[PDB]
Paper text:
In the nucleotide pool, which is more susceptible to oxidation by reactive oxygen species than DNA, human MutT homolog 1 (hMTH1, human NUDT1) is the most prominent mammalian enzyme among other enzymes responsible for sanitization of the nucleotide pool. hMTH1 is characterized by broad substrate specificity as compared with Escherichia coli MutT; that is, hMTH1 hydrolyzes different oxidized nucleotides such as 8-oxo-dGTP, 2-oxo-dATP, and 8-oxo-dATP with almost the same efficiency, whereas MutT shows high substrate specificity for 8-oxoguanine nucleotides. Accordingly, hMTH1 prevents mutations and cell dysfunction by its hydrolytic activity toward both 2-oxo-dATP and 8-oxo-dGTP. Here, we carried out structural and kinetic analyses of hMTH1 and demonstrated that hMTH1 shows broad substrate specificity for 8-oxo-dGTP and 2-oxo-dATP because of the exchange of the protonation state at Asp-119 and Asp-120 depending on the substrate.
To validate the correlations between the structure and kinetics in the Asp-120 mutants, crystal structures of the Asp-120 mutants (D120N and D120A) in complex with 8-oxo-dGTP or 2-oxo-dATP were determined, respectively. In contrast, during the recognition of 8-oxo-dGTP, the structures of both mutants (D120N and D120A) show modes of binding of 8-oxo-dGTP that are different from that of the wild type. The face of 8-oxoG and the direction of deoxyribose are completely turned over in comparison with those in the wild type complex: this phenomenon is the result of the loss of two hydrogen bonds between Asp-120 and 8-oxoG. In the D120N complex, Asp-119 and Asn-120 interact with H-N2-C2-N1-H and O6 of 8-oxoG, respectively, whereas Asn-33 with O6 and N7-H of 8-oxoG. The 3′-OH group of deoxyribose in both complexes is directed away from Thr-8 and Gly-34, which are involved in the recognition of 3′-OH in the wild type. These findings are in agreement with the higher Km values of both mutants for 8-oxo-dGTP in comparison with the wild type. The electron densities of 8-oxo-dGTP in both mutants are ambiguous as compared with those in the wild type. This result indicates lower occupancy and/or loose binding of 8-oxo-dGTP. The differences in the recognition of the 8-oxoG and deoxyribose moieties between the wild type and the mutants give rise to the difference in the position of the triphosphate moiety in 8-oxo-dGTP between the mutant structures and the original ones (active configuration bound to the Nudix motif) in the wild type structure. The structural arrangement of the triphosphate reflects the lower kcat values in both mutants.
Numbering used by the authors: 1 to 156
The structure:
Amino acid sequence: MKASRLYTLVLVLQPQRVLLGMKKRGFGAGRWNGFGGKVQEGETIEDGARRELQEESGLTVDALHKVGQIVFEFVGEPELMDVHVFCTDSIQGTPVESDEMRPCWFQLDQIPFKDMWPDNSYWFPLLLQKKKFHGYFKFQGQDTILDYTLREVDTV
Ligand SMILES: Nc1nc2c([nH]c(=O)n2[C@H]2C[C@H](O)[C@@H](COP(=O)(O)OP(=O)(O)OP(=O)(O)O)O2)c(=O)[nH]1
């Protein structure tokens, strides 16, 4: 009986590494994140994901593939986040730091889970195995999960 707002999250996943972005400023700074943000009026979810990737990382790609959907709920916030998660298939430039985000590559045996949002530990492994998923996580603040669900699915 809550409303949701649409967000995207994009993982540039290559065979041996993944690109993540360090939030540099404001509340939440200091954590490594996928690239993403609010979907804007009119644009498709995929086009919103492509735009956020360009804005936050500098990479321009023609196409993404959707791998999952995750709902976030925060204690004290009545609006849910409806997060559509995408991976890149191919990229063709270099990442660039903004004043808001610093991109960095991590080898896939060095995924920095302790410095990522806590839910990422649950769904990232499915993403790495090329599986699709649906998830829901309820947070007290930034660090504490009170309830969550995660299910591999055949169709997002
Ligand atoms: N639980 C969880 N929350 C995340 C992840 N990544 C992520 O940005 N968030 C949270 C932090 C923020 O509350 C929200 C992101 O919203 P935002 O306002 O930063 O998005 P945005 O950059 O489009 O905002 P704006 O600059 O356009 O105002 O989602 C994640 O992987 N897991």
